[PDB]
Design a protein around this motif. Structure first.
Motif, mmCIF file in Angstrom:
data_model
loop_
_atom_site.group_PDB
_atom_site.id
_atom_site.type_symbol
_atom_site.label_atom_id
_atom_site.label_comp_id
_atom_site.label_asym_id
_atom_site.label_seq_id
_atom_site.Cartn_x
_atom_site.Cartn_y
_atom_site.Cartn_z
ATOM 1 N N UNK A 366 -0.740 5.647 2.600
ATOM 2 C CA UNK A 366 -1.513 6.670 1.859
ATOM 3 C C UNK A 366 -2.961 6.820 2.359
ATOM 4 N N UNK A 367 -3.552 5.707 2.795
ATOM 5 C CA UNK A 367 -4.922 5.686 3.299
ATOM 6 C C UNK A 367 -5.040 5.956 4.804
ATOM 7 N N UNK A 368 -3.953 6.359 5.461
ATOM 8 C CA UNK A 368 -3.981 6.734 6.886
ATOM 9 C C UNK A 368 -3.216 8.003 7.274
ATOM 10 N N UNK A 369 -2.483 8.617 6.350
ATOM 11 C CA UNK A 369 -1.707 9.813 6.658
ATOM 12 C C UNK A 369 -2.711 10.963 6.705
ATOM 13 N N UNK A 370 -2.931 11.480 7.916
ATOM 14 C CA UNK A 370 -3.970 12.481 8.188
ATOM 15 C C UNK A 370 -3.401 13.693 8.917
ATOM 16 N N UNK A 371 -4.115 14.813 8.816
ATOM 17 C CA UNK A 371 -3.716 16.053 9.485
ATOM 18 C C UNK A 371 -3.956 15.964 10.997
ATOM 19 N N UNK A 386 2.534 9.173 12.304
ATOM 20 C CA UNK A 386 2.219 7.788 12.639
ATOM 21 C C UNK A 386 1.859 7.009 11.376
ATOM 22 N N UNK A 387 2.695 6.019 11.049
ATOM 23 C CA UNK A 387 2.644 5.281 9.778
ATOM 24 C C UNK A 387 2.870 6.234 8.609
ATOM 25 N N UNK A 388 4.013 6.909 8.670
ATOM 26 C CA UNK A 388 4.429 7.877 7.667
ATOM 27 C C UNK A 388 5.868 7.600 7.217
ATOM 28 N N UNK A 389 6.248 6.324 7.213
ATOM 29 C CA UNK A 389 7.651 5.922 7.083
ATOM 30 C C UNK A 389 8.076 5.686 5.637
ATOM 31 N N UNK A 390 7.182 5.105 4.838
ATOM 32 C CA UNK A 390 7.327 5.134 3.383
ATOM 33 C C UNK A 390 7.050 6.549 2.865
#
Ligand SMILES: Nc1ncnc2c1ncn2[C@@H]1O[C@H](COP(=O)(O)OP(=O)(O)OP(O)(O)=S)[C@@H](O)[C@H]1O
Ligand SMILES: [Mg+2]
Length: 404
Positions: A366-371, A386-390
């Motif tokens: 949640x603290x790294x999912x960016x546009x 990238x780190x969007x797996x959960x």
């Protein structure tokens, strides 16, 4: 009707000072009455201005066009005295009024029938519902089909990035194309109550507020789920009496594979616990057998009569088949990305979902999912994958079960 809605109904008529124009763009907020008066005004214009001519109406898909536009347009036309004959298999309508008759072909931006038909057909007016969600290749092709003398172009959408093809090509070059432009805030729909309007305000914060409430073409930059709040969204991992259940799954032997146990309690879905397996990190990739075996150990405790099935992405057919063999209910997820993100944002804004404090990889994500900043300045709003797996699992769940 509101003053702005009535301008949409009348701009094309002979008395109007703006009936010169080659078309019209209506954009702005959700639930503003753009589509309904726009499509109604379009058929009126066509039945008045022409006879025995072809007309086009486009949507993201034809089924989308049918939900938003065509079904409520029929009740409107039938009520005003317009006889309609819908030819559902062939994707066109025959609207007829005071001896005059015209033909309204239905199109999808992505459909294979629609590319085949649009290239050949020769129209006298085209209409576009949710035009920003359509390919630009499609609208350029369809606008060229409006060859008949006195054809008009109608465009209808909600806002997107300020580098979006429609904003840059169509809206900024407005006088160049001789197009009319009205912009709808939510106050231009008089049928809404002030009570109901302020409910819709609470559904959106951040970029989506500015886009879908204020109607502004603002740039998707930085963190996607900025409204997530460890004050508001995290709860302790203490047992509760959950009514229904689901497991949401982002699958990848290649990358991490995730599960999530979701549970309903007092009209709120709780992400009860997470499973997070990274084959690279662990240095041992898992098989579908190994993953199926894990899903069972993951849902050993809950009561099988409540367990309502596994939401999983269509590109895991190797996995999907095994679950059905072993006899699990398997929901193919609604994959659409921007629409899933927007709906997850709404779920966080409204607390339709909460998270137990053991979803530790979920909060990191949640603290790294960016546009994608590079893509957004082309007019393409996407996540950086990238780190969007959960978060992809959480998106499938929210979009598939919670929203329509
Ligand atoms: N004259 C009217 N009388 C009653 N209800 C109306 C009227 N005009 C609009 N509405 C309602 O207002 C809502 C929004 O109308 P739409 O035309 O679907 O909105 P829209 O601007 O296309 O919204 P998006 O952007 O597609 S979410 C719908 O529930 C309509 O039924
Ligand atoms: Mg609409």
């Amino acid at each position: 009707f509101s003053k702005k809605q009535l301008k949409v109904l009348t701009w094309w008529r002979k008395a109007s000072p703006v009936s010169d124009k080659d078309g019209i763009i209506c954009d702005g907020s959700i639930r503003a009455g753009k589509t309904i008066v726009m499509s109604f005004s379009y058929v009126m214009w066509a039945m008045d201005t022409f006879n025995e001519q072809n007309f086009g109406m486009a949507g993201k898909t034809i089924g989308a066009l049918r939900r938003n536009v065509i079904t409520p347009l029929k009740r409107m036309l039938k009520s005003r005295g317009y006889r309609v004959k819908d030819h559902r298999a062939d994707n066109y309508l025959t609207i007829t009024f005071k001896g005059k008759t015209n033909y309204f072909y239905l199109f999808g931006g992505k459909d294979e029938s629609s590319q085949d038909l649009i290239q050949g057909i020769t129209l006298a007016g085209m209409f576009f519902d949710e035009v920003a969600l359509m390919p630009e290749s499609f609208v350029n092709q369809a606008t060229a089909r409006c060859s008949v003398d006195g054809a008009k172009l109608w465009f209808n959408c909600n806002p997107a990035g300020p580098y979006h093809w429609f904003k840059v090509e169509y809206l900024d070059k407005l006088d160049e194309k001789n197009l009319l432009h009205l912009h709808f805030t939510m106050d231009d729909n008089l049928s809404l109550s002030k009570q109901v309007k302020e409910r819709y305000q609470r559904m959106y914060k951040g970029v989506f507020y500015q886009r879908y409430i204020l109607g502004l073409w603002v740039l998707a930059e930085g963190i996607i789920y900025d409204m997530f709040d460890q004050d508001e969204h995290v709860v302790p991992t203490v047992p509760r009496p959950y009514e229904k259940y689901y497991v949401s799954c982002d699958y990848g032997t290649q990358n991490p594979t995730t599960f999530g146990l979701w549970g309903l309690y007092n009209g709120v879905w709780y992400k009860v616990k997470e499973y997070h397996y990274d084959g690279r990190k662990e240095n041992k990739q898992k098989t579908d057998q190994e993953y199926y075996e894990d899903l069972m150990k993951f849902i050993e405790d809950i009561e099988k009569h409540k367990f309502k099935g596994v939401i999983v992405d269509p590109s895991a057919a190797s996995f999907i088949a095994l679950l059905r063999q072993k006899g699990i209910k398997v929901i193919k997820a609604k994959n659409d990305v921007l629409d899933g993100i927007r709906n997850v944002a709404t779920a966080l804004n409204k607390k339709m979902i909460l998270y137990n404090d053991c979803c530790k990889e979920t909060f990191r994500e949640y603290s790294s999912y960016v546009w994608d900043e590079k893509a957004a300045e082309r007019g393409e709003d996407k996540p950086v994958k990238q780190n969007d797996h959960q978060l992809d699992a959480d998106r499938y769940f929210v979009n598939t079960i919670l929203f329509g």
